[PDB]
Structure formats: C-alpha cells, structure tokens
Amino acid sequence: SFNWGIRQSYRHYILKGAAGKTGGQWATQGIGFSGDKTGIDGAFNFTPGKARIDGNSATIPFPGFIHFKGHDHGSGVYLLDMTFSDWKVVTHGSTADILVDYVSYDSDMSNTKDRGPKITGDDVVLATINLNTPADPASGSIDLSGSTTLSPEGAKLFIAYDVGSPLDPTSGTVALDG
Numbered sequence: 001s002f003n004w005g006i007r008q009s010y011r012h013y014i015l016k017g018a019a020g021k022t023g024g025q026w027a028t029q030g031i032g033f034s035g036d037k038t039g040i041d042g043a044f045n046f047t048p049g050k051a052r053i054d055g056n057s058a059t060i061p062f063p064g065f066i067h068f069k070g071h072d073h074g075s076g077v078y079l080l081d082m083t084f085s086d087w088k089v090v091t092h093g094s095t096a097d098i099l100v101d102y103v104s105y106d107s108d109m110s111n112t113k114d115r116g117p118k119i120t121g122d123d124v125v126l127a128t129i130n131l132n133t134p135a136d137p138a139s140g141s142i143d144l145s146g147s148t149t150l151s152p153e154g155a156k157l158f159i160a161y162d163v164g165s166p167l168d169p170t171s172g173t174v175a176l177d178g
C-alpha cells in the first residue's frame with residue numbers, strides 16, 4: 001500500500017473551508033482513506049498493480065480515482081469539480097514522480113454563477129517525491145516514503161499554490177508483482 005494525503009490544507013479546504021461550506025465533499029473508487037480527514041496523518045490508500053521495469057526505473061500503477069467537489073452557490077452546478085485518475089509512480093533513482101490524469105475547471109474565485117473552462121491533463125506529473133531511500137527495482141520492493149513538492153503542471157491545476165510548494169509526505173513499501 002502506497003499512502004499519500006495530497007495536501008492536508010487542501011483536504012481541509014474541501015471539507016471545512018470555503019468549498020466545504022458550499023457543498024464540499026469527496027468520493028473515491030478503488031482507493032481508501034485512513035486517519036483524520038482534515039488532519040496531518042490522513043492519507044488516501046493506493047493499491048499497486050503490476051509494475052513495469054525499464055532498467056532502474058519502475059512504473060507502478062494504482063487503479064481508481066479521487067473525485068473532489070465543492071462550491072455549489074445555488075446555480076445547480078458545482079463550480080469546483082476535480083477528478084484525479086490513472087495514478088502511477090515512476091521512479092528515477094532517488095526521486096519519484098507522481099503521475100495522474102486530471103479533469104478540472106479553472107476559476108477566478110469570484111464568479112458564483114458561471115463555471116469556468118474545463119482543463120484536462122493526461123500523464124501529467126502532479127508531484128515529485130524526494131525519497132528517503134533510493135528506489136531499486138532489482139530488490140523486488142520499493143519504499144515510497146519521503147517528502148513531496150508540487151509540480152509546475154499541478155500548480156496550474158490547484159491554482160492557489162506556488163510551484164515547488166510542499167505537499168503531504170508519502171509512505172508505504174509496495175511489491176512489484178501485481
């Protein structure tokens with residue numbers, strides 16, 4: 001199991017912040033959750049698929065999606081509507097990239113009637129793990145614990161955060177068999 005809470009302050013925003021006061025929620029398929037929902041130890045739980053090895057680089061898939069919603073301001077439409085699927089982690093020695101397919105919508109955070117334009121991204125790097133131990137695919141297992149920073153492409157997706165902002169730390173050792 002690979003564990004990551006994306007960002008604690010983002011999960012607090014969806015459930016208790018300005019998104020949470022206007023219909024904020026999340027839903028998952030294939031992915032669990034453990035810990036405090038708006039807390040530091042809270043993390044989504046990703047189950048690995050069959051890994052793919054290219055030398056010293058493992059690409060580990062994790063099936064399922066995470067769907068965040070919020071900001072119903074009475075128009076019948078969720079103005080925040082953010083789906084994260086096709087989770088994969090590609091290791092690059094001492095770092096690992098977290099890859100997603102997203103569907104989201106842009107916003108100026110002012111218009112409470114009109115949903116902004118759809119944005120998608122396929123095989124987009126969302127974050128990079130500075131790994132505690134370097135990833136070796138020849139050992140049969142990869143420890144994914146480490147600290148994370150937000151990518152330039154996820155920073156377009158999350159809007160409010162800077163490029164290279166810290167995200168939630170990761171944990172868990174997964175096997176590569178399936």
Ligand code: HEM
Nearest residue numbers: 009010013017018071079080107109110111157158159160
């Ligand atoms: C009309 C719609 C929206 C309004 C009025 C709005 C307003 C706000 C407000 C008041 C905050 C401050 C909350 C806080 O700091 O605790 C906030 C933060 C934030 N908003 Fe929005 N927002 C809207 C839509 C969106 C959308 C579509 C996104 C999608 C990317 C988004 C992403 C964020 C993020 C990431 C934060 C930072 C949360 C954190 O970690 O503390 N917002 N917004």
